[PDB]
Design a protein around this nucleic acid. Structure first.
Length: 20
DNA sequence: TTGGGTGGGTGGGTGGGT
């Protein structure tokens, strides 16, 4: 409800690698 | 043959690889 999760690859790593 | 640890693992492996 806050993170993508549906992303695959650097897509999610560059979306918020800052975890949460 | 579909990224890498020049990002992290109280994001996850019902996402893929080193």
């Amino acid at each position: 409800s806050m993170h993508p999760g549906h992303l695959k690859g650097r897509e999610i790593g560059m979306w918020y690698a800052k975890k949460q």
